[PDB]
Amino acid sequence: MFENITAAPADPILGLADLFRADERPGKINLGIGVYKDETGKTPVLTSVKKAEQYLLENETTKNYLGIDGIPEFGRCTQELLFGKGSALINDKRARTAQTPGGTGALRVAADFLAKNTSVKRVWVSNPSHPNHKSVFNSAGLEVREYAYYDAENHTLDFDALINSLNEAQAGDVVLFHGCCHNPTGIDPTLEQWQTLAQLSVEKGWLPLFDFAYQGFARGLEEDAEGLRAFAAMHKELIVASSYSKNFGLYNERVGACTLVAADSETVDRAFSQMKAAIRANYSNPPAHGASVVATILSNDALRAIWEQELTDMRQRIQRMRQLFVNTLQEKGANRDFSFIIKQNGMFSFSGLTKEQVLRLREEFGVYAVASGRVNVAGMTPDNMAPLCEAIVAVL
Amino acid sequence: MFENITAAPADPILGLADLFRADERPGKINLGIGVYKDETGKTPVLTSVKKAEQYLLENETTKNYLGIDGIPEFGRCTQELLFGKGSALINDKRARTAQTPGGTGALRVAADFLAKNTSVKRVWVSNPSHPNHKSVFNSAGLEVREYAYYDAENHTLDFDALINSLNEAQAGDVVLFHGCCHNPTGIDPTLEQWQTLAQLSVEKGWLPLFDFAYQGFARGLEEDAEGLRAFAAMHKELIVASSYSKNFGLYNERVGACTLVAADSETVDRAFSQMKAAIRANYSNPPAHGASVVATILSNDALRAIWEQELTDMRQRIQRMRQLFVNTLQEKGANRDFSFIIKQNGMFSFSGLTKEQVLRLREEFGVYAVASGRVNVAGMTPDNMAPLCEAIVAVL
Numbered sequence A, B: 001m002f003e004n005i006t007a008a009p010a011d012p013i014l015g016l017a018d019l020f021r022a023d024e025r026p027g028k029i030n031l032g033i034g035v036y037k038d039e040t041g042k043t044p045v046l047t048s049v050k051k052a053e054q055y056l057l058e059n060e061t062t063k064n065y066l067g068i069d070g071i072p073e074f075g076r077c078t079q080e081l082l083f084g085k086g087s088a089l090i091n092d093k094r095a096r097t098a099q100t101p102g103g104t105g106a107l108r109v110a111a112d113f114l115a116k117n118t119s120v121k122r123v124w125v126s127n128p129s130h131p132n133h134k135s136v137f138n139s140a141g142l143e144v145r146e147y148a149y150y151d152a153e154n155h156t157l158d159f160d161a162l163i164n165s166l167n168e169a170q171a172g173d174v175v176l177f178h179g180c181c182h183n184p185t186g187i188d189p190t191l192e193q194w195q196t197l198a199q200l201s202v203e204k205g206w207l208p209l210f211d212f213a214y215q216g217f218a219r220g221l222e223e224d225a226e227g228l229r230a231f232a233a234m235h236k237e238l239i240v241a242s243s244y245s246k247n248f249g250l251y252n253e254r255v256g257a258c259t260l261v262a263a264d265s266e267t268v269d270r271a272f273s274q275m276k277a278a279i280r281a282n283y284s285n286p287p288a289h290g291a292s293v294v295a296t297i298l299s300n301d302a303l304r305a306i307w308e309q310e311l312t313d314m315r316q317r318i319q320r321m322r323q324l325f326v327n328t329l330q331e332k333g334a335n336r337d338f339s340f341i342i343k344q345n346g347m348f349s350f351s352g353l354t355k356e357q358v359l360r361l362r363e364e365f366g367v368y369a370v371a372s373g374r375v376n377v378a379g380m381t382p383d384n385m386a387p388l389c390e391a392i393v394a395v396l
């Protein structure tokens, strides 16, 4: 039965971990997956989290089945983080959140839903975009197309190509955006550009689909959401797939949410009923651990205080590594100008390296980056900064 | 976009818990969801588990993503559980396991796989069977045919019918089997019957898919594995979806696995690489908490010796509840003869109640049972045994 199966090609992102986790070279450098690292070079369990985790221990009396849509405070907390502690969607009971296995569980369930209970046929992902976006949407059945985004020559958002491209979109089509910290470009639209698009959408009849993974890594928790909230005020319906993987450092405990907004309480209610039906024949219900962690903190004033300190420390570090990168790079006499790198935001950097360069970097020097030239600034350390910069300059 | 979606019908199983909670009848009893209860009517968290959890608290240093397929001890330990310590599948390296969210997640990753990489067109699920089986398979896109199992009047396994119905099963079809504790009948085939069914499939050309979720609730860890192992001995290709939800009291953690066996180490390895691509476009990688726990309980001698006693207690307690139930039923005036109930295995008994009786019990008396007449014995306690038997009795 399986004699004919064919091997699948390594995950461009995930796979790198293996290759890296196998070369027995003293000073290698993994700059591949998007996980935060500290000055010493490791992803520590955040402190607020360890705290929540003790509380769980001491206070948990049961492991009984969560509902299909998980814990309800988790859902509730998620919505204010998204929309506002005030907002209308909350206030008229327009949204319904389902706890899910990370951002990817959210993306996928939105896809099972759309594909089975609506009339969507295509989805519009940017160019570039996270490699797995395509895989997921295709699994559900939907056809993906691409819109124009980045201007590789200038290192800016090519708005007018972005717009024209989309003009190929049809009313009733899905158009996925990244709420902030564009991946892999790190270039986000401006609040006016967000408003514009928000309006255009509304006229062309598009169904917005936000992929929100880095809330708090660009400017702040609340201001990171302006685009999303810009759309929220104009739209009648929208789905949102958030993730607390990168902002709570809960990577492995798989924590995120799928937020369904619709015209009115009765409507979203009816739509949610199927969305559950879709969770039911996938993973059944959600894993408690992380969503319990997250909730505990989000509902405790002290804990939340500590957690919000941790986040800004992460953010700030990275901001330091990006200045220190172009600098050393400069002092190591790199050919080109790498100044744009300072202008991008989030963990990564769209380096500008070609396929062969990034390949060589690896064999030659054991410095791991994604094929596309996507580098992980958060894996950069003052201690690995010099050798890394030598590698880079030498293949350039 | 969403204005026409219709409301989905409630889960027959997971849907009861809604109503039960939402019910205000003081003396209500709940016999719905297959969740274990203790003398006091609480689903507690195992000692060994709590113990394992302390450890993780003190010893865990990172949240960094696990791999697509999870934690390697985990898969290692589960293959020993399944096939036995010195197994040949283990020695010839024919198996490959992936950590999944729950057993359902196991089920679904198998369907997604088979459907996308093989030429499977349909699967054969028992009659009756767990009601979610159909839905997961339909989601993958497969077609579900029913075989003949249970013999209503005699409350016995109808081998003849089983055998002749399966006779419509093409070579290349999938045939789901319940390793032990047949949900919802509690009737399992004998070791010979297992042996007979193992030959036909081999003769017939089917792919076995095993739902293994109650390992240890029938006779014992190893004893419960016999049928599987009987099948593993002659099969070149197999699939096993096992769960850690019942025997570890980890319900909301989502622990399970999808074990892929093949002909040789190179074939299985190839086939798995596709499986790993299926997982990737679904939830991405699995939840570390609950798999960690299990991996710890099974790898540490003491922690394991304890766990094994906990399971023994669960199993027996239920056994004690079956005898009491038919008993009380009898000297409380039961028309029918319910003793067949003593000869079933696991948490449930297939009462033989009419949809209308179950509907009534619920409405008149406050007693929650699935609409097929499936009752959760494990939820039965000596302090509820009486009002329960009285309710039933009045509807007969």
Ligand SMILES: *Cc1c(COP(=O)(O)O)cnc(C)c1O
Binding pocket: A034, A101, A102, A103, A104, A105, A130, A178, A183, A211, A213, A243, A244, A245, A246, A251, A254, A255, A256, B283, B284
């Ligand atoms: C990491 C990432 C995801 C996946 O989120 P997980 O919670 O890790 O599954 C989705 N989208 C973007 C843009 C990401 O960076």
Ligand SMILES: *Cc1c(COP(=O)(O)O)cnc(C)c1O
Binding pocket: A283, A284, B034, B101, B102, B103, B104, B105, B130, B183, B211, B213, B243, B244, B245, B255, B256
């Ligand atoms: C409980 C059960 C399942 C669901 O298992 P989870 O680990 O809860 O996802 C699947 N199949 C059968 C036969 C079950 O009894």
